[PDB]
Structures are given as structure tokens and as C-alpha cells.
Amino acid sequence: EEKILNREIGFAIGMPVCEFDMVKDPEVQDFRRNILNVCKEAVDLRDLNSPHSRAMYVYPPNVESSPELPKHIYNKLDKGQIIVVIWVIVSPNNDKQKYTLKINHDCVPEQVIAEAIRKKTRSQGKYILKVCGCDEYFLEKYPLSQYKYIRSCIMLGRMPNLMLMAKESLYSQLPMDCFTMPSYSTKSLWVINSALRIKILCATYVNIDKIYVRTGIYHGGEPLCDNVNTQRVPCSNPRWNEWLNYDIYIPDLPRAARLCLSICSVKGRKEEHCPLAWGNINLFDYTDTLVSGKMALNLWPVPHGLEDLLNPIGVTGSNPNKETPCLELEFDWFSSVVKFPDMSVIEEHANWSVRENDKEQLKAISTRDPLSEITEQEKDFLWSHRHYCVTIPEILPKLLLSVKWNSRDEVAQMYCLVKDWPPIKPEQAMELLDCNYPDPMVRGFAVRCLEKYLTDDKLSQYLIQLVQVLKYEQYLDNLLVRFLLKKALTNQRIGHFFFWHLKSEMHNKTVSQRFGLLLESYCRACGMYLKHLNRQVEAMEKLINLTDILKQEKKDETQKVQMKFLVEQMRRPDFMDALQGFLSPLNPAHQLGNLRLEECRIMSSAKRPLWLNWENPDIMSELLFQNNEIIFKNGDDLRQDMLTLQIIRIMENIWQNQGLDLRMLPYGCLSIGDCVGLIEVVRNSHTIMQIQCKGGLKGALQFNSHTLHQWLKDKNKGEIYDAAIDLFTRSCAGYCVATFILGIGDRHNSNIMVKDDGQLFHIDFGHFLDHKKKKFGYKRERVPFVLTQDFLIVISKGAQECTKTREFERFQEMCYKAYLAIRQHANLFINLFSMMLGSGMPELQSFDDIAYIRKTLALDKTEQEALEYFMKQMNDAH
Ligand SMILES: Nc1ncc(-c2nc(N3CCOCC3)nc(N[C@@]3(CO)CCN(C(=O)OCC(F)F)C3)c2F)cn1
Known part of the structure; x- marks a missing residue:
């Protein structure tokens, strides 16, 4: 009954629910019960206009925030109209019949349906539109072009393929609501006219010349008074039994005031001070009560690169591992429960x-x-x-x-x-x-x-x-x-x-x-x-286990021996059942059917990622993609990639709204656990190295700076050649500016990719916020702005004096405007990185890393001075 639900919740979190029942902290138990009010409100909102409101909870509309189309996207339409294909499964034989429409870009889904019924009958409100190939529906009265799939089709020159479906077919498949309530459901601060004092009693689980407790009263990283230390004691005996007095009066304590502690070491060689463990305490509890009486705090290990003796930004509360340094403290009792004023x-x-x-x-x-x-x-x-x-x-x-x-x-x-x-x-x-x-x-x-x-x-x-x-x-x-x-x-x-x-x-x-x-x-x-x-959790655990064995036990073996173990491990019944028939964590609208094992390989890139391939079991999979290809990687903190890919998407919106068509490619990426995750494979793409090692000859100097342009001309013969050079130029301009502003490193030709139509994009954002300079090469090939000779040949359509053509001037103007558009929105970008400063991402650990964006954006100069700085950086690359 509830035991079934609790066992399934436990498998989802990866923690048994009875562990939360064992926690005696009243804040924990009050949270578990009080948050249920949010659950009941969401469950009631889902049944308001049931079953339509329930259908829109499970299948919400994937739309852009605004119906307004920039003037350059409205020009991609034919006199403000779009051509869409509406499919129908007729039965018997389950024949796929299409009906092509030419309708106003802003037609609402019901106007599209009515026009499809008209075109079909030429030979009422009981239907819905679904995207062919995936579980994405158009259940809301938005203009057609506001749906991300239609907006994407307009911009990418593609034809929308939608499927007409009976409203009953979908609604009948929506499960009934199963939310069930779980079984687990004074003086004023300002009348105390004394200064704050806290007693430091003793420490346990602390086995060096001397040890002391460093303390401070803080409010969001800022100290409210001077720091106060206990006396230094020789390590063996950490008994202090000492009242620490702060120069702050109890009524002047802000609501979010914290006590920040640390056990520090002193070594006399200039006295060397080192923090051994840290812990922060809220001075008021969740019910606004000023803390009083005895308290024990289990401390945390010092995070890498702390540089200070206290950790005021760090998490508040006792370490759940009770077999760690434990500090006993005592606060004053003012003969009554003290509360923060109303x-x-x-x-x-x-x-x-x-x-x-x-x-x-x-x-x-x-x-x-x-x-x-x-x-x-x-x-x-x-x-x-x-x-x-x-x-x-x-x-x-x-x-x-x-x-x-x-x-x-x-x-x-x-x-x-x-x-x-x-x-x-x-x-x-x-x-x-x-x-x-x-x-x-x-x-x-x-x-x-x-x-x-x-x-x-x-x-x-x-x-x-x-x-x-x-x-x-x-x-x-x-x-x-x-x-x-x-x-x-x-x-x-x-x-x-x-x-x-x-x-x-x-x-x-x-x-x-x-x-x-x-x-x-x-x-x-x-x-x-x-x-x-x-099902997603269980498939991911099978892949994490598989890649862990590969990286630890069979790490040194050859590609053939690695593939033999992979195939053998994947053919196992438990594995096959777990890796087939589940939704994609990259996009839950994508169903992952049967694994195409023969197409699955261990890639030769850093950390040896897994290239996986599943059949798309959608009745209309041919109209989207027959196979879903995803990379599963063990070893990288893909949160850096998620943060970079979000920034690229935001930068692209800035450019698009300003009339700057710099086509970017923020493919999907999802962090699944500790340095494990999924990466969306962009189909029909090739690295510059693969393009160069196709037009390159065995025994000859590889990485030649004229192969890229040649491969693109063979792929785009005719009028489609001009469009490919233009797409390459705009996408290369956007990625040069983006990789420059963010300081994206490892810009080797295996991390820079190109599509058949000319579209260039970057991959692997394991290095950002620095100028990681190569140990060898030419001066122009080792500057922060990455623009190769190979790209200049494509941009200039083959010319030998590429930095002198009119096409290079047009590419330069694109870069200048793209750079200035991002400098105008700098506060947003600095803030998105700053919000992530406490994540533990290897390349974002301090404000010095974010200061790199302040330098590339030249925020301490004037608009004209920043543009000339950017021009000098562009010129250094050639
Ligand atoms: N953090 C992090 N970020 C990205 C990656 C990563 N991502 C991609 N891409 C593929 C395109 O879609 C976007 C993701 N590819 C990688 N490896 C290859 C390229 O270097 C090696 C040869 N290869 C190929 O032939 O792919 C066939 C074709 F699709 F490209 C792909 C790769 F490591 C890894 N770690």
C-alpha cells in the first residue's frame, strides 16, 4: 500500500524513506508535514479543468516566452504564412496519410485542425495535434509559431510534421490522481540589553603544535563583528570550557545571523594557520527562536582551495556523519524563549x-x-x-x-x-x-x-x-x-x-x-x-556500473578487448531489460525503445565515453529521427557543460532579438550524478580533424589549412554553396565571440565540429574561465581568441589573401556587434556564474574565475575602449 510507494520513492532518491523517519530534528519533521500543503495545492490545480488541465500537466506546451517574431524570422515565412504537414493514421492497414496546409504563422492549434479536417473531407472539436516522432502535444491556444518545434522549423528551413489525434485517445491514457497523504502527517530579542557571548566547551574526534577554535558572527559572508578565538591547546586535550565574548549586542543581531566555527591548527616553523574542520550555526532557528543552551555540532571537511580560516558561505548545520570532529557549545538562556520581533x-x-x-x-x-x-x-x-x-x-x-x-x-x-x-x-x-x-x-x-x-x-x-x-x-x-x-x-x-x-x-x-x-x-x-x-534511474545505474568497471578494472586493455566486455555485459538479460523501454533523461518526450547494440561503441575521446543508440519506437519516427543517439560519459563534471550550453542559448537569444542571425548549437546535456551524465549527439556532424584526415594523405603533413573549405564545396554544389559559406561565417562568428568571452579551452580540431550545411559548433566545456595556453605552436595559434587559418579560407570562399577580402570585413563586423550585444547584458552573465560559485565545479571555485569575464568583456573600460580591446584580440589571432 504505502509500503510499496515508500520502497519506490527510496529507489528514486537512492535513500530509504525510513532514514527520514529516524531523524529527530523537529525542523526535518515539520518540513515533511508542512510541505504536503504544496502537494495538495498542485494536485488540486491539476484537476481544476480535468481532464484537459491534467493533460497539460503531463504534456505541457513547449513554447517560447513571446509570440513576437524578430523581423528576420518573419522574413523566412512566405508572406507571413507557414507550410505544415498534417498526418492521420486511417486504419485498417494503419496507413499514413498526409495533408499539406499553408496557414498564417500565428494560427492557434484549433484553426490548424479545422483546416486539416477541411482538406481531408474535400475528396468538430474532438482532436489534438502531436509532433510526429515524439510525445510533444499542442494542447494550448498559443499561436503555432510560438511552439518551440514550429519556431525551430521556421528558423531551420524545415517542414513541420504534426499528427492529428483523437482527444479521447490521449485523455483515456492519463492515469488517475494517486496523491495520498503519508502516515507521518516569550521574550522579544530586543528586550535583552547584553552583548553576545558563546561558550566553547570541548571537541571529540580530534586526534601539530596547537589547536584552537576560530569563531565569527556573519550575515551572508560578511562579518558582523571581529572574529574571536579560544586559547590554543596542545592537540591531545581539546577542552576549552571558555566563554567567547563578541562586540555585538543581542538586539543588533539580524534575523539571518550565523555563528561560523572552525578548528584550526598552528605550526611554528611565520606562524602557519590551517583549518581542520568547519561548521556554521544559524543563531535563530526555523521558528525565529534565538538559540540557547547546550548544543553539539559535527564539523565538515575543508573544501579544496578555501584560502581562509572560516567558511561563512558553507552550508549550515551538523554533519550527518557523527564520527567526525564534534564541538560542544553553550548559549545563554534568558529565563524565557527569546523570539525575533514581529x-x-x-x-x-x-x-x-x-x-x-x-x-x-x-x-x-x-x-x-x-x-x-x-x-x-x-x-x-x-x-x-x-x-x-x-x-x-x-x-x-x-x-x-x-x-x-x-x-x-x-x-x-x-x-x-x-x-x-x-x-x-x-x-x-x-x-x-x-x-x-x-x-x-x-x-x-x-x-x-x-x-x-x-x-x-x-x-x-x-x-x-x-x-x-x-x-x-x-x-x-x-x-x-x-x-x-x-x-x-x-x-x-x-x-x-x-x-x-x-x-x-x-x-x-x-x-x-x-x-x-x-x-x-x-x-x-x-x-x-x-x-x-x-526506469530512468535503473538504466543510469546500469551504465554507471558498466563505465566504472571499464575505467577501474579494464582501463588499460585495447579497444577490441574493451568492446568484447561491453557487448557481453550489454547482452545480459537484466541489462537489456533495464536499458530498453524508458524515456530519455535529456528530453522525456523521446522514448528509448530497443538498444541497437551493433551501433553502440566505446569512443576514443578523453575518459572513453559511451556512444549509445536506441530505436525511436514512435509510429512516425521517420519524420523526426529513426534512432536516438546519446553519449553517456563517466569522468566529467557535466554541470560546467550545462552552464556553458545555457549561456550559449541566452547569447543566441540576445543576438537573434537584435537582428543578428548568429546560429548557435546548444545541444542537450544533463548531469545525472557525480561526474556522470548524458550528451545529445548532433546528427550529420564531423570534427575538423575528421574532415582533415579525409582530404589528408598517408605519410604527408596532416592538419592542412585548406581541407575544410574543399569538403564543404563537395557537400554544397550550386546555389546551396553560398548559403553554406554564410551559415559557416555566422556560426563561426558566434562561437569565436562566445569561446573568447567565456575563455573556453582545449579548442583542438576534435572539439570543433561542422555539419554538412556549413554549421559550425563547439563541444566539451571542461575548461572555461581561463586562458589555457598550449605548450608549443605559433604565436597566433596560442592567443585567447581562437580563429584558425582553415576557417578564414571558408569565410573568404577560397581566397589566398583571406584577411583582405570583403567577406572577412563582414565577418569582423559580425564579431564586433556580437561582442557589444553581450557586453550590454554582462550583469546577467556575471550573475549566472556567480549563482553557481558554490557548486564545486572544478573550473569555477572563486570570484577570480568569474573576473575572467569582467576582463574579456572589459567592464572596467568604456564601450569604445572595450571594442578596441576586442579588436586587438581578434587581430592577435591572424
Ligand atoms: N564534456 C563533453 N562534451 C562533449 C563531448 C563529446 N561530444 C561529442 N558530440 C558529438 C556531436 O554532438 C554533440 C556532442 N562528440 C564527442 N566525441 C567525438 C567528437 O570529438 C569523437 C568522434 N565522434 C564522432 O565521430 O561523432 C559522430 C558525429 F556525431 F560527430 C564524436 C565528445 F567527446 C564529451 N565530453
Whole structure:
């Protein structure tokens, strides 16, 4: 009954549900019960206009955020009209009959259906349109061209193939709702007029000259007073029994104040100080109670490259592995439960607390990026004009950093300004969810802006950042988690990726409990989709096990011997059952039928990825792709690839909306677990090395700089030649600018690919945010801007003086405009990286890595000065 559901939830999370029942922490048990209200709200929203609302939960419309088509995309249409093919399965014989329509690009799905019924009858509202080849439906009254598949077809010059289906055929297959409620369902802070003191008792599980406890009171990475240390003791005896006194009074403690601890080592050789373990504690609990009495905290291992003695950004709470350094502490008891004051009380205290050159200086401060330095004079300038700031709402992040958070008088006044602040755009509100803004009223404002202005499309686009910033929340139950869970439980496409973003981090013990509890409530209310997720989990476990054996046990063996083990392991019954008949985690609309074993190989690229091939079992698979090819890789942190691919997509939208048709290729990529994941294979593509080692002769100098252009001319003879050179130029321009801005390394000719039609794209983003310079080669082949002689020959249509042709001038102008369009949206890009700073991605571990984008974008120069910097970089590559 519930034991069946709990066993299936346990298999999905990879953690038994009875482990959550064993947790005595009241915050954990209150979260498990209180989050069920979000589940019941999502389940009721799903049945509002049942079964149409249920069908749109399982098969939501995959649309762009705006119906507006840029003038250059409207020109791809024939007088504002599109040609679409509508298919029908007639039965008997199950014949495929097509009916070709020419309709207005903005026709709603029912107008398309009516026109297909008209064309078919030439020889009422009971039908739906489905994309041929995949489980994607057009159930909503959006203009046809707003659906991503139709929008993609217009831009890619392809013909839409849709399938006409009976409404009953789909609705009858929707399972009934199975959400069932689980069985597990004062003094004021401001009247204490003393300074804060905390007792450090003793440590256990700590076996070096001396050891000490370093402590500090922080609010979002910023110290609220000076750090205070215990006395140094010789390692063997870590008993301190010492009260530490802080220079901060209890009423001046902000709501998100934390105690940040560390056990540090001292070595006398200049005294060498090293942190051995760290732990942070929220000074107020989830019920707003100031902590008091004895407490024990199990500490965490120091993350690589900490560089400081404390870890104030790190996760809050005790290490679940109790067999780690354990610090015992004691807080004061003020003869009653102390609580943070009510909003009305804070509002009463805020009231009791109280040129044109200046209006332009406030506007300039407002447009600076999240990493730009804000001086002490500027902080005083911003806070003194805090009332004029409400009229430039985009300055709220700069103003929040000007507040003295260790002063309840300034904070009470900031709460009044936050309460009446005008709503801001989601890309600006997302910055207020990073580690710099722990205050719940600031965070609450930010989430309300997201609920008001975020479409389901933009929510999906920014899901990686929103799931990562959950780690920064002080408590399990918060406004952000409730917003994401409700969205995941009301749109199954969002729920699918939301599941995988949490599941893929369950190995990280700093988030295991938060994400595991969040996963339990999602699995309990996602419905029958849990059965599909379990099949995805089990197929991925079989591949992770297979690739682990290959990388550890049979690593050195030859390709033939590796393939013999692969084929033998894949032909096993348990393996075949697990790897066939499940949905693609890259896109759950793609069904993965039978494995085409003969087409599966171990690739010769770094970490030896697996090239897998499945039949697409859709009745109309021929109209999309007969076979789904996916790369499964063990060894890379594919979250860097996910972050880069998201940025490329956003950069492409910036360019497209500005009339700059720089065709990019952000193929799918999904992190499945610890350095494991899936990569979408782009069909009909070849690396530059493969093109060069086809026109190259055995024994002769390989990697010649004229093969690329020759191969493209043989593939595009005639009028289609001009289109291929143009597509190559635009795509190469976009990828030169993108790889430059982001500092993408390993730009060898096996990581740069080309399609038959001329489209160039990059792969493998295991290196970003640096100039990784080759150990050998020519000066022009080792500069940050990567543009080869091979590309210049294609761009100039074969000319020998390629840097002098008119086609190279047109390619240069493309690069200049593409560079400036991204520099205008720099704040967004800096913020998307900054939100990921605590993920543990090998190439993004500090603000110095993000500072690389501030240099390539030349944010500390003027618009004209940045363009000349970019021109000098382009010129260095030739
Ligand atoms: N982090 C990370 N990111 C990307 C990759 C990766 N990705 C792709 N691509 C393929 C195209 O679609 C996009 C993904 N290919 C790879 N290997 C090859 C190219 O180097 C080796 C020969 N090969 C081929 O012949 O493919 C046939 C044709 F499709 F290209 C593919 C590869 F390692 C790995 N790790």
C-alpha cells in the first residue's frame, strides 16, 4: 500500500524513506508535514479543468516566452504564412496519410485542425495535434509559431510534421490522481540589553603544535563583528570550557545571523594557520527562536582551495556523519524563549529611528555588475539616498549591501523600504537569492518577483541556478522551495529536470538531507511519473556500473578487448531489460525503445565515453529521427557543460532579438550524478580533424589549412554553396565571440565540429574561465581568441589573401556587434556564474574565475575602449 510507494520513492532518491523517519530534528519533521500543503495545492490545480488541465500537466506546451517574431524570422515565412504537414493514421492497414496546409504563422492549434479536417473531407472539436516522432502535444491556444518545434522549423528551413489525434485517445491514457497523504502527517530579542557571548566547551574526534577554535558572527559572508578565538591547546586535550565574548549586542543581531566555527591548527616553523574542520550555526532557528543552551555540532571537511580560516558561505548545520570532529557549545538562556520581533514591532522601531549630479551618480552605481566594487563612500552615499532609490528599483542589490546589518536601526528601516519596493525583472531578482543576501525579507521579495514575472520557459532556462541557490537558504521550509516544488508538481517537464537537478547532487553530503527531503515530497505527489523516473534511474545505474568497471578494472586493455566486455555485459538479460523501454533523461518526450547494440561503441575521446543508440519506437519516427543517439560519459563534471550550453542559448537569444542571425548549437546535456551524465549527439556532424584526415594523405603533413573549405564545396554544389559559406561565417562568428568571452579551452580540431550545411559548433566545456595556453605552436595559434587559418579560407570562399577580402570585413563586423550585444547584458552573465560559485565545479571555485569575464568583456573600460580591446584580440589571432 504505502509500503510499496515508500520502497519506490527510496529507489528514486537512492535513500530509504525510513532514514527520514529516524531523524529527530523537529525542523526535518515539520518540513515533511508542512510541505504536503504544496502537494495538495498542485494536485488540486491539476484537476481544476480535468481532464484537459491534467493533460497539460503531463504534456505541457513547449513554447517560447513571446509570440513576437524578430523581423528576420518573419522574413523566412512566405508572406507571413507557414507550410505544415498534417498526418492521420486511417486504419485498417494503419496507413499514413498526409495533408499539406499553408496557414498564417500565428494560427492557434484549433484553426490548424479545422483546416486539416477541411482538406481531408474535400475528396468538430474532438482532436489534438502531436509532433510526429515524439510525445510533444499542442494542447494550448498559443499561436503555432510560438511552439518551440514550429519556431525551430521556421528558423531551420524545415517542414513541420504534426499528427492529428483523437482527444479521447490521449485523455483515456492519463492515469488517475494517486496523491495520498503519508502516515507521518516569550521574550522579544530586543528586550535583552547584553552583548553576545558563546561558550566553547570541548571537541571529540580530534586526534601539530596547537589547536584552537576560530569563531565569527556573519550575515551572508560578511562579518558582523571581529572574529574571536579560544586559547590554543596542545592537540591531545581539546577542552576549552571558555566563554567567547563578541562586540555585538543581542538586539543588533539580524534575523539571518550565523555563528561560523572552525578548528584550526598552528605550526611554528611565520606562524602557519590551517583549518581542520568547519561548521556554521544559524543563531535563530526555523521558528525565529534565538538559540540557547547546550548544543553539539559535527564539523565538515575543508573544501579544496578555501584560502581562509572560516567558511561563512558553507552550508549550515551538523554533519550527518557523527564520527567526525564534534564541538560542544553553550548559549545563554534568558529565563524565557527569546523570539525575533514581529513585523509590526520592527515597523514601530523604524519610524522611531527617523541634486542632478547625484541622480546621475545613483544611476551609474545601479548599472554596475554584481562583482564591481562598491566603496565605503558609495555605501554611505546610497544609504543616505535610500528614499530616492525606490525610483531606480534595479539598485536594490547595491542598496542592500550598503545597510549595516549589525545595526537593528538601519535594518528596521531597510525592511520598510523592501516592503514597498517596486517589483523587478527575474534576471535582477535572481541576484537577491545568491549567498550575499541571506535576509528572509530580501529573499521573499525576490521569490515574489519570480512568481509574478517568470514564464514556465524562463523558469526551465534558469532552473540550474534556482536549485543551486536552495543550498543558501537558512531553513528547509522557505518561499523559494515552495515555489519550485509547486512548479515542478504542475508542469511535468519542469518536474523531470527539477528531479534530475536534485538527484544528481545526492552524493554531496552537505545537501543530501535537504535535497533528499525535497525529493521525497516531489516523488510522493508527481503521480505515475515516478514509475518512469525509476526506469530512468535503473538504466543510469546500469551504465554507471558498466563505465566504472571499464575505467577501474579494464582501463588499460585495447579497444577490441574493451568492446568484447561491453557487448557481453550489454547482452545480459537484466541489462537489456533495464536499458530498453524508458524515456530519455535529456528530453522525456523521446522514448528509448530497443538498444541497437551493433551501433553502440566505446569512443576514443578523453575518459572513453559511451556512444549509445536506441530505436525511436514512435509510429512516425521517420519524420523526426529513426534512432536516438546519446553519449553517456563517466569522468566529467557535466554541470560546467550545462552552464556553458545555457549561456550559449541566452547569447543566441540576445543576438537573434537584435537582428543578428548568429546560429548557435546548444545541444542537450544533463548531469545525472557525480561526474556522470548524458550528451545529445548532433546528427550529420564531423570534427575538423575528421574532415582533415579525409582530404589528408598517408605519410604527408596532416592538419592542412585548406581541407575544410574543399569538403564543404563537395557537400554544397550550386546555389546551396553560398548559403553554406554564410551559415559557416555566422556560426563561426558566434562561437569565436562566445569561446573568447567565456575563455573556453582545449579548442583542438576534435572539439570543433561542422555539419554538412556549413554549421559550425563547439563541444566539451571542461575548461572555461581561463586562458589555457598550449605548450608549443605559433604565436597566433596560442592567443585567447581562437580563429584558425582553415576557417578564414571558408569565410573568404577560397581566397589566398583571406584577411583582405570583403567577406572577412563582414565577418569582423559580425564579431564586433556580437561582442557589444553581450557586453550590454554582462550583469546577467556575471550573475549566472556567480549563482553557481558554490557548486564545486572544478573550473569555477572563486570570484577570480568569474573576473575572467569582467576582463574579456572589459567592464572596467568604456564601450569604445572595450571594442578596441576586442579588436586587438581578434587581430592577435591572424
Ligand atoms: N564534456 C563533453 N562534451 C562533449 C563531448 C563529446 N561530444 C561529442 N558530440 C558529438 C556531436 O554532438 C554533440 C556532442 N562528440 C564527442 N566525441 C567525438 C567528437 O570529438 C569523437 C568522434 N565522434 C564522432 O565521430 O561523432 C559522430 C558525429 F556525431 F560527430 C564524436 C565528445 F567527446 C564529451 N565530453
